[PDB]
Amino acid sequence: SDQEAKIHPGVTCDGCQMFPINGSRFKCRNCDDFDFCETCFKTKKHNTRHTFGRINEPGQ
Numbered sequence: 001s002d003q004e005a006k007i008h009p010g011v012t013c014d015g016c017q018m019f020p021i022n023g024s025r026f027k028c029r030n031c032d033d034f035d036f037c038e039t040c041f042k043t044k045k046h047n048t049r050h051t052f053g054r055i056n057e058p059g060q
């Protein structure tokens with residue numbers, strides 16, 4: 001089984017508009033409703049004082 005195959009239904013990556021996010025999902029703990037896919041999480045600029053929660057699969 002492959003983490004990249006996991007999808008998060010209804011979740012858009014705000015960095016690249018991927019929908020649904022596949023792979024691990026990174027939800028910002030400070031923004032109201034902001035998510036990154038993993039590539040965007042590693043490469044896009046974001047408030048350096050915000051912290052993201054890693055959600056590998058729906059329900060976490």
Ligand SMILES: [Zn+2]
Nearest residue numbers: 013016037040
């Ligand atoms: Zn993305």
Ligand SMILES: [Zn+2]
Nearest residue numbers: 028030031050
């Ligand atoms: Zn944020």
